[PDB]
Each structure stands twice: as C-alpha cells, then as structure tokens.
C-alpha cells in the first residue's frame with residue numbers, strides 16, 4: 001500500500017511505503033485520534049522474532065542479506081537465546097541500533113544529524129561509580145568546549161527487570177527546583193520532586209535559582225547513588241540581549257548540553273533502560289518552553305514589564321512581543337559564546353530536506369507534527385505546512401516510568 | 412473505553428466518554444496516525460434519522476415520550492414513501508447548532524448555542540440564493556458588531572439537483588496570474604477567479620477585488636452576482652506605532668463566512684449552508700498575510716522595520732510577524748469590527764472544553780487546528796491534550812463543484 005503526504009505551501013506530494021514495516025500500536029483507532037496525547041522480563045517466544053527482524057534489517061543495511069555471515073549470526077543468536085534466555089549485540093549492531101532509534105524518533109526535528117552519533121559502549125559497567133565516570137566522559141566529549149557533538153552512552157541491558165541500570169535524572173544537566181513554604185518556587189518548577197529526592201538522599205542544596213542537580217545513579221537494580229558532575233565540565237551561557245542592556249540583569253543563564261537520560265532504548269527486543277543521549281539545543285526549547293511556560297521559569301511578565309509593553313490587554317500582543325525578544329537573546333547569547341545552537345527556522349528547513357530525502361531513499365519518515373512544529377511562530381516555519389505520518393519503527397526510544405515509582409528499595 | 416485527557420500546565424485531568432457515541436472514521440489506524448493530514452438509500456437513512464431524533468428528544472427531556480415515538484413513526488413513514496424526509500424547524504436549528512458544537516477544528520465553539528439560523532429551504536433559484544445571502548451578510552455584519560449566522564438552502568435529493576455556493580467563503584479576494592510570472596491579489600483564488608472570468612465577470616484586476624458569488628440552484632448551472640459593495644465591511648490595516656504601515660495598502664474584510672462545506676443532520680445533506688462568525692486575528696495576520704502561498708508580506712514588512720535580514724537567527728521573520736498581527740488587531744478594534752485575539756480565544760476554548768466535559772462527557776478537538784499558528788505554547792491549548800473524533804450532526808468538506816458539475 002501507498003500513503004501520500006502533501007505540503008500545502010509547495011504542493012510537493014510524497015509517497016510513504018515505510019509505514020508497512022511498522023508493527024507497534026499508535027494509540028489511535030479508526031474512531032479516535034490520540035495524536036495530541038503525550039503518553040498514548042520478556043519471554044523466549046517474543047524475543048527471537050524481534051532479534052531476527054532486527055538482524056534482517058542490519059544485514060540488509062550492510063548489503064549482506066542472506067549471506068553466510070547473516071545466517072551464522074541468526075543461528076548464533078537463536079542458540080544464545082535458548083541457552084541463556086537473552087543475547088548480546090555485537091558492537092557494530094549496537095551502533096547501528098542506536099543510530100536507527102534516533103532516525104526513527106518521530107518527535108525529533110533534529111534527525112538530519114542521525115548518522116553522526118558517537119556511541120559509547122558502557123555495557124561492561126557494573127557500579128554506580130562506574131556509571132558516573134562514563135557520564136562525565138560523555139559530557140566532556142559531547143560538550144567539546146562549545147562545539148557540541150552528538151553522543152549516546154549505553155549501559156547494560158535489562159535482564160530480569162530486577163537488576164536495571166537507570167539514570168534517575170530526566171536529563172544529565174538540569175537545575176534544582178525548591179517549593180517554598182509560601183507556595184512560590186525557587187529555580188525550575190519542573191524539577192521539584194526530583195530535587196526533594198536528591199535532598200532526601202543527602203544532597204546539600206545551595207538553594208539558588210540555577211543549582212545544577214547531582215546525578216542519581218542506579219546500577220544493577222541497586223539503590224541509586226548521588227554524584228556531583230565536576231562543575232568545570234558543565235558549560236553554561238549567561239543570557240543577554242543584543243539591544244537591551246537590562247536583559248543581563250534578569251540573571252538568566254542556561255546550560256549548553258541537552259542530554260535526555262530517562263528513555264529506554266529498544267534494539268532487537270533488548271531493553272537498554274539507561275542510555276543517556278545528547279545533541280544541541282534548538283533555541284525555542286530554552287527561550288519558549290524553559291523560560292516562558294507558566295509552569296517553568298515563567299519570565300514573560302518581568303520581561304514585558306522591562307520592555308514597557310502595554311500589558312492591560314492581551315490584544316496588544318505583549319506576550320508575543322516579549323517572547324520574540326527572549327528568544328533573540330538566547331540565540332545571541334549562545335552564538336556569542338560559541339556554543340552550538342540552532343534557530344527554529346534553520347532546524348525546520350533542514351528537517352524538511354531530511355524528510356524528503358528519507359521518503360526518496362527509505363520510503364518514509366515517521367514524524368509527529370504536534371512535536372515537530374516549534375512552540376512559537378508555527379506557520380512561518382515550513383513544517384507547519386507539511387503533512388506527516390506518525391508510526392512506530394524499531395529500534396526506538398521509549399518513555400519509561402520514573403524509577404522512584406517502581407524501585408524496590410533495598411536499604 | 413473511558414479516556415483521560417490531561418492538561419500539562421495545570422495537571423487537570425478530564426474523562427472523555429462522549430467519544431463512544433462517535434460513528435464516522437478518523438483516517439487513523441492502530442498502525443498509523445493521520446492527525447496532520449488536511450483531508451483524510453432508504454436503508455441507510457432511517458438509522459441516521461433515528462440516531463438524530465433520539466438525541467434531539469433527549470435534549471428536550473422527552474426521550475421515550477409519545478411525541479418522540481410519534482415523530483420516529485412519522486419520519487419512518489415519510490422515508491418509506493418519499494425516500495427522504497423533512498426536518499421540523501426546531502430540529503433544523505438544533506442540528507445546525509450541534510454541527511458547530513461538533514466541529515473539532517473550531518476554537519470558537521464557546522459560542523455554539525448563539526447561532527442565528529436562517530431557514531432557506533424554500534429557495535428555488537440562484538437569484539433567491541443571492542437575496543438570502545445578502546440578508547445573511549447584512550445580518551451577521553451588523554455594522555461591525557458581528558453576529559454568528561448560518562443560512563440553510565434545500566437538502567440534497569437525488570444528487571443531480573444540488574444547491575452549491577461555488578465560492579469557498581462569501582467574501583474573498585480575486586487572484587490573477589501576471590505576465591511578470593507573479594501573482595496579483597490572493598494566490599489562493601486564482602482558479603476560482605478564472606472560472607468567474609470565463610463565466611462572464613469583468614475583473615478590475617486589482618490586489619483586493621471582492622469576488623462575485625457563483626450560485627448554483629437545483630443542480631442548475633451556477634450564475635454570477637456581485638454582493639452589494641455597501642454590504643461588504645472592509646478594514647484598512649494600520650499600526651499603532653509604525654506610520655509607514657498604512658502605505659503597504661493592506662486591507663481585510665470583517666466577515667469570515669465559510670460557504671463550501673456540507674451540513675449533515677439526521678442523514679440529510681445540506682450542500683449549501685454558508686455560515687459566519689468573526690475572525691481570530693491570526694487567521695488574517697499570520698495566515699492570510701504571511702503564508703508564502705498567500706499575500707506573503709513578511710519580507711516587505713521586515714524591510715520597512717529595517718531588521719537584519721542576513722541571518723534567520725536574528726528572528727526577523729518572527730519580529731515582523733508579531734507587528735503585522737498587532738496591526739490587524741488594532742485596525743479592527745479602532746474601526747469597531749468584532750475580532751478576537753488568540754490569547755482570549757484559546758482561553759475561552761479551554762473554559763468551553765471544561766464545560767463540555769462536565770456537561771456532555773467530552774469535546775472533540777483537533778489540536779493541530781486548535782493551537783494558533785503563532786506563539787503556540789504561550790496559549791493554554793498547546794498544553795491541553797485533546798481527543799479528536801467525529802460526531803453528527805457535522806460540517807464536512809466536499810469536492811469543489813467545478814469538478815463535479817456537468818454544464
């Protein structure tokens with residue numbers, strides 16, 4: 001079967017066949033679309049088909065499909081599964097797998113970059129201290145003094161589900177949040193619960209507006225342990241505005257390295273529950289969401305106050321005006337300090353070129369419009385006008401529950 | 412079977428049961444989401460009529476009453492003997508209001524119960540259609556104090572006698588292709604303008620020429636009529652700060668009046684049902700003015716502002732966007748023509764969603780259309796999970812008549 005998508009600005013029509021290789025569920029049915037819902041131990045029986053489907057894809061990609069090496073590898077994996085109930089990936093397969101999980105991540109606008117991913121194999125790690133060392137090395141490598149390089153660090157896979165490796169942090173670098181007795185929040189309101197856990201675990205909180213959180217690291221299903229990332233490895237950018245000299249006195253800064261650490265990587269039926277990965281920011285992630293969401297730093301009013309905008313009526317568009325200036329500030333600040341960042345025009349234009357290339361060479365590119373369209377200036381980016389098809393391919397990155405909800409405390 | 416939607420800003424969780432009543436298909440499957448795609452007999456008719464009459468009698472708290480049973484009976488007999496049926500005025504009004512209530516792509520539905528319904532089922536000719544439409548235009552415009560209205564022409568019969576308004580909206584501007592290779596006017600209306608010219612319209616060949624109506628009665632060949640110029644309320648666009656803005660020579664019309672959709676009520680199909688409300692400012696300032704395939708004015712505005720257009724990262728497009736949108740809202744407000752900004756409209760929609768959840772068990776909403784085309788996440792609807800599903804009565808897309816029609 002063939003499915004078409006249309007760009008309503010260019011009238012370019014593309015044809016998707018790749019969707020035929022999807023087997024996992026979307027959440028939608030013929031009677032309901034759940035496109036805007038944020039969240040819509042394996043047996044031997046389920047495992048070998050998943051391994052075989054993956055190894056078939058891997059051997060096809062290297063133009064060795066049906067070879068003796070391919071057949072030998074299927075046999076080797078089959079035997080390993082029946083003998084040990086699981087199997088181990090070759091390094092080549094792991095690298096291919098991680099790259100493909102990124103290529104398949106339908107909510108990621110940055111995928112033009114997917115084939116350039118440094119994979120750090122941390123499957124020989126056994127302790128939380130060992131995890132800390134791997135993560136420091138990842139941060140230093142990825143940061144590269146501001147010339148950011150995409151990377152992923154992959155810790156041992158799930159075995160019985162009782163021995164999981166997990167990074168409890170949702171990203172490697174994030175700022176603490178503290179709920180005050182008066183109901184206000186100091187720092188980042190997104191991280192209040194996790195900050196409370198860190199403190200309970202023994203972290204000495206500085207209690208400021210941009211305190212970098214400690215890592216809370218779980219190895220082999222043991223209770224997690226706290227570590228402080230060496231501050232010299234945490235690159236940060238003070239935020240200033242090219243025309244407005246009062247902007248610096250808002251005292252804003254952000255970290256350069258966006259590093260998602262709470263997702264589960266599935267490759268060939270194996271589950272990598274600790275697989276922190278990093279790229280670089282698109283400016284709106286910081287300037288629109290982190291700064292201006294009502295439930296985050298929430299700086300819109302204070303900025304618009306300083307700009308002396310007419311704030312008596314929403315129809316003056318004061319919030320929109322202040323929004324643009326904050327985002328100019330973020331891009332200017334990162335660029336001035338030579339820390340990699342991409343604006344939403346550049347990133348979306350590149351994504352459309354990537355998507356068209358994927359259609360032509362791969363037969364499709366699953367994309368979640370709800371997440372791909374930037375959270376400001378939607379229709380002046382080309383992705384707003386692009387029809388997309390959202391479906392699930394493996395290898396993949398998946399959401400998993402926060403570990404404090406499921407962890408069996410040993411004591 | 413029972414579904415939750417969460418707002419991620421407020422943590423408020425709502426439970427949707429209303430979706431179980433849905434009957435029509437979304438385009439999605441368990442394998443593929445098509446959320447972002449713009450376009451994804453006697454025996455058939457009585458179940459549709461019954462489903463509708465049941466909801467109607469429920470709504471007036473007479474479900475299972477003698478008058479309910481008698482009406483089902485009457486309608487059954489009428490379909491059996493005539494192959495169709497006629498709605499009571501009360502049913503027609505209820506159905507039209509509910510089609511709007513069910514419109515999952517409409518952010519303005521807090522307003523749904525305040526709809527003036529003009530019953531034009533007695534109309535027989537295109538001149539009649541013109542009269543009804545001028546009256547709708549004048550009523551809805553109300554010298555700038557706009558009032559929501561719909562005018563409902565006769566229902567589909569055998570499908571060879573369709574009433575259609577060929578125009579996509581009652582009021583739109585002509586588009587013409589130039590020797591220059593460029594487009595004069597609205598590029599969205601080139602084909603339609605050409606049909607107009609070929610049918611006899613003499614075009615002024617300007618940038619903002621109000622198109623004539625092309626009206627089709629009783630499956631006849633469509634005829635041309637110019638809407639009295641004095642009934643078309645237009646707004647010159649100026650900026651409260653930029654003195655130069657007025658010299659771009661921009662204007663827009665006050666009355667958004669969709670005329671190309673099909674109203675389905677109780678299985679009956681109303682192929683000409685132009686309806687109107689009032690504008691959300693982004694519709695004109697972001698989409699009509701700044702779409703690359705529309706008036707595409709961003710470049711000109713940015714230049715008069717003297718922005719650095721060297722790099723995308725100076726956010727020059729974004730700055731100019733906000734200013735164009737400020738000017739649209741200012742111009743409409745100064746001339747006292749009803750308009751709503753995207754903050755106010757989306758705030759109202761959230762309130763309406765909560766009302767619908769509390770009172771009806773849900774609200775079908777298409778997030779892709781509901782979230783405004785600028786400043787998405789600083790409006791509350793961005794953070795609101797929505798479930799999209801199709802309820803009847805409904806407004807549906809239908810093929811442009813010029814492909815369908817045989818002359």
Ligand code: HEM
Nearest residue numbers: 102105107108109110113150151277278279280281282397
């Ligand atoms: C290289 C520069 C990159 C850019 C500019 C970029 C851009 C983005 C943006 C803007 C989002 C949405 C974020 C949000 O709204 O919270 C996102 C999501 C995501 N990206 Fe990327 N990305 C990059 C690299 C990567 C890498 C290296 C990976 C993994 C190898 C990745 C995988 C993902 C995944 C799985 C999501 C969904 C996250 C979720 O559901 O929470 N991206 N990307």
Ligand code: HEM
Nearest residue numbers: 511514516517518519522559561686687688689690691806
């Ligand atoms: C009263 C003020 C109203 C406001 C502020 C409003 C708001 C909007 C907006 C902003 C859109 C998106 C349009 C686009 O992006 O092209 C829309 C779509 C729509 N609205 Fe409304 N609306 C109003 C009245 C109405 C009325 C009176 C009806 C029917 C009686 C209606 C039914 C629809 C339908 C069916 C759509 C989808 C149209 C399509 O798919 O082309 N709305 N609404």
Ligand SMILES: Cc1cc(N)nc(C[C@@H]2CNC[C@@H]2OCCCCCc2ccccn2)c1
Nearest residue numbers: 038039258259260278279280281282285399
């Ligand atoms: C409940 C939930 C589900 C899900 N799939 N994903 C999340 C992630 C949350 C949603 N809101 C905030 C947070 O997003 C984290 C930031 C993602 C950074 C992605 C990125 C990666 C690399 C480069 C640039 N950007 C939460």
Ligand SMILES: Cc1cc(N)nc(C[C@@H]2CNC[C@@H]2OCCCCCc2ccccn2)c1
Nearest residue numbers: 449450667668669687688689690691694808
């Ligand atoms: C192909 C297609 C499908 C569809 N469902 N609807 C349309 C209508 C198209 C979609 N983009 C442009 C045009 O929309 C017309 C503008 C509708 C105005 C709606 C409105 C109605 C009332 C108040 C304010 N606004 C087109």
Ligand SMILES: C[C@H](O)[C@H](O)[C@H]1CNc2nc(N)[nH]c(=O)c2N1
Nearest residue numbers: 036037038370371793794795796
């Ligand atoms: C409810 C809704 O799906 C939610 O707010 C989504 C919308 N689109 C998004 N898009 C991105 N990139 N990131 C997000 O967190 C979200 N949040």
Ligand SMILES: C[C@H](O)[C@H](O)[C@H]1CNc2nc(N)[nH]c(=O)c2N1
Nearest residue numbers: 384385386387447448449779780
């Ligand atoms: C392809 C995509 O569905 C298309 O550009 C949509 C997106 N959201 C929209 N939202 C509204 N309100 N109106 C539109 O015309 C569109 N166009």
Ligand SMILES: [Zn+2]
Nearest residue numbers: 028033439444
């Ligand atoms: Zn869907």
